[PDB]
Design a protein around this nucleic acid. Structure first.
Ligand SMILES: C[C@@]1(F)[C@H](O)[C@@H](COP(=O)(O)OP(=O)(O)OP(=O)(O)O)O[C@H]1n1cnc2c(=O)[nH]c(N)nc21
Ligand SMILES: C[C@@]1(F)[C@H](O)[C@@H](COP(=O)(O)OP(=O)(O)OP(=O)(O)O)O[C@H]1n1cnc2c(=O)[nH]c(N)nc21
Ligand SMILES: [Mg+2]
Ligand SMILES: [Mg+2]
Ligand SMILES: [Mg+2]
Ligand SMILES: [Zn+2]
Ligand SMILES: [Zn+2]
Lengths: 72, 926, 154, 150
RNA sequence: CCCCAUAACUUAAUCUCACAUAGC
RNA sequence: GCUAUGUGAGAUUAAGUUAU
């Protein structure tokens, strides 16, 4: 569903900006290109791929702890 | 017959192949610049004399060499023979051959012209001035010959767009040397006519694409040395092509040869007046109107436009490093500064400040503010910059680091999104889906958006047409009062915005409005009328929702400019915003029946109404450098009493220096703006409105002139076309009678809602069908040659039914609803825009909905007319917003009961989730 | 007969209206104080709130690629670079233990993110390229277990 | 009954002049604050102007203004002729290959000896790390700072 | 760091005008 | 007449907010 993807991508980019990804210009450019491409997507199959690519930028680097964010 | 072919090629050894059949003539459909007592215009006619004979080379390959054997009466034949014999020795005259050949018993006199190209200059200028992407065969053939393309360049999708595939600037520029040689040959022809005593009118259709001239039928012989060639229509219609093809590029080389290296030019040299005079006397020698290289010597606004287009044509030869503020080392308190002491414009020439203080002992607040806003001290005291990311000229880097500004993504309102989803919104297949978001950008965003001024090119306008377009636009801008006002009467809203650069470093504009007394502001304004003050403008990235990934930048103009511009232009710009029922709809609210009022205003009395609109692609960055000057001149015409000629010219020069040729500061370094209006000057909306009235009146003018006058049934519009061509290319002074006329004609058949950059046109259908008023094709053709952009058909709309309003005006759709007992037009926006505004906010405080029941009342006010839309999903957004407002209020009350004990004395919050409060804002009673 | 219940109609409105303004000012102050408390609480807990919102929407998405990447990142495999989507480009992903190895890479394939990646260079903690051997059930003292597997997309 | 002056002029009229007296006091205080702001902004702009004249390098600028006939020169040639530092922003490695060189290149006549190269992250870029092989591994709005060599 | 212009809502005061009531 | 009080209509003035 695009309504649930184009919004969670915005949330992910906001979180990344909050945890100082703009310092690295290459990573910021890649993760802003992915975010813009998700927001303009027309097929959910190719939008989830870019959503996955936008993720693993937060997960690759151990900035935010992940075990407690999934207590639910 | 074969004997006719042998007779056509006589002494010359030419191998000819007939281009028709037998001895009969050949019919061609070419453009003509005709002016008779029956027809007058620049249109395409069928020429049915002329037996064309293409010449084939030795290897039997057809080349661009034709032998047009015109058949006409004996008297014209024998007169043209005498005129040719008088003009035989000129090197710019096509080789004529006069003979009589028996066709069927009558020896028809033949006038054979040897070795002339297939097309003429009239055909080229018509193709480039009446461009249609479907019927562009003549332009395609002209590009294929005189090698510019390879007949495969047209296989590209947007091979003409000037934005997509910006390589259409070349392929055109390759015709520049052809056009320049044509100009030299027509100057030679005029010299021969003057030295031989023949008086005649020069037309584009009488000169082939090689420069040769023919058709001496309408030439009269006078005493030798007293010839009077008429070169108004020729040069005037040729002007827009002189800059598309860049004809004056060979003048940048050592011996004016395209193979030799460029001229170096002293870096210090800035005058370039003798060079301009030499260029004018070489290419426009017989243009009888006086040309002033510097516009400071002009009479009243007419040499301003006239000499300014010549200056913008001639300034493409001179180095771009000489155009800018002229600095001089003045001594203040014995310490030498470096401050501007004039300005070198590409259109206004060299302008020198009249008040200069070389030896000063103390600087007042006005002098300090003037010196601090000048870019001289900032650029001189800054490192040299070579910014390869853009093609714009780089001046200096004020700071030792380059600033990269990134756009943050917008914040997500999960509460509103969850509430909407709970109410059956955002489902698979629903007509309302989220399409407006907060697009984020990387570091290379501000500079990338600034590098769109490459779409702004030096455009030379048709002065014989622009000088009448400006009169019609001035008539459109009547019934307004304007002039200069003191600092007492200046109204400023939201004082503390930016104050501009470098004034941001010390405070907002409130500080500079409070620190400067009223007499200080008046003295600063008076200084502007006698001096030129260049200012630095800062570019800032916008942070707002949009449906496109394109970044948006706004120009923050210095307060030193805005303070003077406000005093200059708030007597106007407020009568425009307080006048209801005029062409310009700036200031007219869309509430309380305003939309219906304007719509019924422009429906007016057109006999067969349709609707038409546009969006001006790549505006604010493709606007010609001449049309902004014309706009500022039109807005300065309400000054015949307060200001003199010198004061008005110096105010125009100041506006051009600090708005048009302004020093853009993108990031942390200074660049040079090639041209175009500023988004944030003082008059962006009104300058855009007058620019929109132009190129629409121009579209009407060259759609009414480009019609076959013999095929026009009505005897009134035919005479109107004849007199319009007269007033354009045969009349010098303004004919106020015929300016009031054709303006009444436009108002009767072409009604407009000219808001800034947005327009809706109610035009006569049967007049546009016959080509008597402007259409989509005519407007696109006008934009092609006077805006350097191709306007896509998908960016335009039309309506054949008036029960439905404009398709899209000011991003609001129009629908006819029943309000009470009468039908009215209500503007409803795109529901996706409202939903995106409700979901994606700028800050995190706005995510807390309880803190803002407000802004939701405001979003529901704009979303009320959707409740009457036939679509259920379109109608449900208003109910969604009302329910969310009620939920926000009730959860605020819950929070107040939890945090506090005291509730709120409310009962004036219920109106905010009832339809009656929002319905009352579209009923015309307030 | 008047001036008994009549005079107390304009002077009775005097103190009542004065109380009305006092209550109005008190309510205005209360709502201003509220609008501040909440605004400053919002702007204080922004990072945690955004992270919790993100990870709630990630589970509400109920995807497979995301639900595999996040499950691996919980207690094991996390990437070192952005996940490539083209059939070219390599992806390096740490494998912090034997179980994460066997859950992901089984033999020349890598699973991960709902695709199957072919492995190219199983380099150890330091750099020793481990050939696919000691990465079996036999006591794997393969250095510090982070066996960064470099893997290409099939 | 005739005591109106005791509460309509001794308690109301004697209070009426106080209102505009107080607003005049507030107006004069705000005028004093505006005058202080004017003084501080004057001293700030004067300090700015007197600060960025020492960087003018008044030995090669006096050599080009004096060379002018009328004494006026275009502003766009002052940095090209007098500035002792050059900043070059390179968007791609091809531009660096063409519009830049190793320790020394030439723009606007001159000879610009490169002193340091830095990236968008503004940390550092070594001169040996700018190659076709290593280009993708670099942020590439590269800023090159060079000094005029004379 | 965050432009010009227009419209609209919301709040808060002010200058009153006007209406009404009470007392004198 | 005189203050006193409320009333509604604005108008004026800033502040917040949206839309264009
Ligand atoms: C277009 C024309 F009308 C010219 O304008 C006219 C010559 O001029 P003209 O004296 O006969 O003109 P007109 O009768 O108005 O007087 O031949 C016609 N023509 C037909 N084929 C050709 C061709 O291949 N090349 C050129 N250059 N012209 C051609
Ligand atoms: C950019 C403009 F100057 C244009 O003169 C015109 C419409 O220009 P536009 O942006 O609609 O058109 P654009 O060029 O994008 O066209 P396309 O690229 O889609 O083809 O109003 C101005 N303008 C637009 N928004 C703003 C704004 O917030 N503030 C200010 N001060 N001015 C603005
Ligand atoms: Mg002719
Ligand atoms: Mg003729
Ligand atoms: Mg536009
Ligand atoms: Zn003139
Ligand atoms: Zn004036």
């Amino acid at each position: 569903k695009m309504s649930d993807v184009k919004c969670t991508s915005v949330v992910l980019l906001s979180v990344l900006q909050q945890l100082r990804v703009e310092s690295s210009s290459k990573l910021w450019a890649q993760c802003v290109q992915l975010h813009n491409d998700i927001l303009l997507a027309k097929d959910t199959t190719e939008a989830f791929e870019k959503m996955v690519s936008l993720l693993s930028v937060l997960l690759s680097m151990q900035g935010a702890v992940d075990i407690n964010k999934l207590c639910e | 017959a074969q004997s006719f072919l042998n007779r056509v090629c006589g002494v010359s050894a030419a191998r000819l192949t007939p281009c028709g059949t037998g001895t009969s003539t050949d019919v061609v459909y070419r453009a003509f610049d005709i002016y008779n007592d029956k027809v007058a215009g620049f249109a395409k006619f069928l020429k049915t004399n002329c037996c064309r004979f293409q010449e084939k080379d030795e290897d039997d390959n057809l080349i661009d060499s034709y032998f047009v054997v015109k058949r006409h009466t004996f008297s014209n034949y024998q007169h043209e023979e005498t005129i040719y014999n008088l003009l035989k020795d000129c090197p710019a005259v096509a080789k004529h051959d006069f003979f009589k050949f028996r066709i069927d018993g009558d020896m028809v006199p033949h006038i054979s012209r040897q070795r002339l190209t297939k097309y003429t200059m009239a055909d080229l200028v018509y193709a480039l001035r009446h461009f249609d992407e479907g019927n562009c065969d003549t332009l395609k053939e002209i590009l294929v010959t005189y090698n510019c393309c390879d007949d495969d360049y047209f296989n590209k999708k947007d091979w003409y767009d000037f934005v997509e595939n910006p390589d259409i600037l070349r392929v055109y520029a390759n015709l520049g040397e052809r056009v320049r040689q044509a100009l030299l040959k027509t100057v030679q022809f005029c010299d021969a006519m003057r030295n031989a005593g023949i008086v005649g009118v020069l037309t584009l259709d009488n000169q082939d694409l090689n420069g040769n001239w023919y058709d001496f039928g309408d030439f009269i012989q006078t005493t030798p040395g007293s010839g009077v060639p008429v070169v108004d229509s020729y040069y005037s219609l040729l002007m827009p092509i002189l800059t598309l093809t860049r004809a004056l590029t060979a003048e940048s080389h050592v011996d004016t040869d395209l193979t030799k290296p460029y001229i170096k030019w002293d870096l210090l040299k800035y005058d370039f007046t003798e060079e301009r005079l030499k260029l004018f006397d070489r290419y426009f020698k017989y243009w009888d109107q006086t040309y002033h290289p510097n516009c400071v010597n002009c009479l009243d606004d007419r040499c301003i436009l006239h000499c300014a287009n010549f200056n913008v044509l001639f300034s493409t030869v001179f180095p771009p490093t000489s155009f800018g503020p002229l600095v001089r080392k003045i001594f203040v308190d014995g310490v030498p500064f470096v401050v501007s002491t004039g300005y070198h414009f590409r259109e206004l020439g060299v302008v020198h400040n009249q008040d200069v203080n070389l030896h000063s002992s103390r600087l007042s607040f006005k002098e300090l503010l003037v010196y601090a806003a000048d870019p001289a001290m900032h650029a001189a005291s800054g490192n040299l910059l070579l910014d390869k990311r853009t093609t714009c000229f780089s001046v200096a880097a004020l700071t030792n680091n380059v600033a990269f500004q990134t756009v943050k993504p917008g914040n997500f309102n999960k509460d509103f999104y969850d509430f909407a989803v709970s109410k059956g919104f955002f489902k698979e297949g629903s007509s309302v889906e989220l399409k407006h978001f907060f697009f984020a950008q990387d570091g290379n965003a501000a500079i990338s958006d600034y590098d769109y001024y490459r779409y702004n090119l030096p455009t030379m306008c048709d002065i014989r047409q622009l000088l009448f377009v400006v009169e019609v636009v001035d008539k459109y801008f009547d019934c307004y009062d304007g002039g200069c006002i003191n600092a007492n009467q200046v109204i400023v809203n939201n004082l503390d915005k930016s104050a501009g650069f470098p004034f941001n470093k010390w405070g907002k504009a409130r500080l500079y409005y409070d620190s400067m007394s009223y007499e200080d502001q008046d003295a600063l304004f008076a200084y502007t009328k006698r001096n030129v003050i260049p200012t630095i403008t800062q570019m800032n990235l916008k942070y707002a929702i949009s449906a496109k990934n394109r970044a948006r930048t706004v120009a923050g103009v210095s307060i030193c400019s805005t303070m003077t511009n406000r005093q200059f232009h708030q007597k106007l710009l407020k009568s425009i915003a307080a006048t209801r029922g005029a062409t310009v709809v700036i200031g007219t609210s869309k509430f309380y029946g305003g939309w219906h009022n304007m719509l019924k205003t422009v429906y007016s009395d057109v006999e067969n109404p349709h609707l038409m609109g546009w969006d001006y692609p790549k505006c604010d960055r493709a606007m010609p450098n001449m049309l902004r000057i014309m706009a500022s001149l039109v807005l300065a015409r309400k000054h015949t009493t307060c200001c003199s000629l010198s004061h008005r010219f110096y105010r125009l020069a100041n506006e051009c220096a600090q708005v048009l040729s302004e020093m853009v500061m993108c990031g942390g370094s200074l660049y040079v703006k090639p041209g175009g209006t500023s988004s944030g000057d003082a008059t962006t909306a009104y300058a855009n409105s007058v620019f929109n009235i132009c190129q629409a009146v121009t579209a009407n003018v060259n759609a009414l002139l480009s019609t076959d006058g013999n095929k026009i049934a009505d005897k009134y519009v035919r005479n109107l076309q004849h007199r319009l061509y007269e007033c354009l290319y045969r009349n010098r002074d303004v004919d106020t009678d015929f300016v009031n006329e054709f303006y009444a004609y436009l108002r009767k058949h072409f009604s407009m809602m000219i808001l800034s950059d947005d327009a809706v046109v109610c035009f006569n259908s049967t007049y546009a069908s016959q080509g008597l008023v402007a259409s989509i094709k005519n407007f696109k053709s006008v934009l092609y040659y006077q805006n350097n952009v191709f306007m896509s058909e998908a960016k335009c709309w039309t309506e054949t039914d008036l029960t439905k309003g404009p398709h899209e005006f000011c991003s609001q759709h129009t629908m006819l609803v029943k309000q009470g007992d009468d039908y009215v037009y209500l503007p409803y926006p795109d529901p996706s825009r409202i939903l995106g505004a409700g979901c994606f906010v700028d800050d995190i405080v706005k995510t807390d909905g309880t803190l803002m029941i407000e802004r939701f009342v405001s979003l529901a006010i704009d979303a009320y007319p959707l409740t009457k839309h036939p679509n259920q999903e379109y109608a449900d957004v208003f109910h969604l917003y009302l329910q969310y407002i009620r939920k926000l209020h009730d959860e605020l009350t819950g929070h107040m009961l939890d945090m506090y004990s005291v509730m709120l004395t409310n009962d004036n919050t219920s109106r905010y989730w009832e339809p009656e409060f929002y319905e009352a804002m579209y009923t015309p009673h307030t | 007969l008047k001036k008994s219940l009549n005079v107390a109609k304009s002077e009775f409105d005097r103190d009542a209206a004065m109380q009305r303004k006092l209550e109005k000012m008190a309510d205005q102050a209360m709502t201003q104080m509220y609008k501040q408390a909440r605004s400053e609480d919002k702007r204080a807990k922004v990072t945690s709130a955004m992270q919790t919102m993100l990870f709630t929407m990630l589970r509400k998405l109920d995807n497979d690629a995301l639900n595999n990447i996040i499950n691996n990142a919980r207690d094991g495999c996390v990437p070192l670079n952005i996940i490539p989507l083209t059939t070219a480009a390599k992806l390096m992903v740490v494998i912090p233990d034997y179980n994460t190895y066997k859950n992901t890479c089984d033999g020349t394939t890598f699973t991960y993110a709902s695709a199957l990646w072919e492995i190219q260079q199983v380099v150890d903690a330091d750099s020793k390229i481990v050939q696919l051997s000691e990465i079996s059930m036999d006591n794997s003292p393969n250095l510090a277990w982070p066996l960064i597997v470099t893997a290409l997309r099939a």
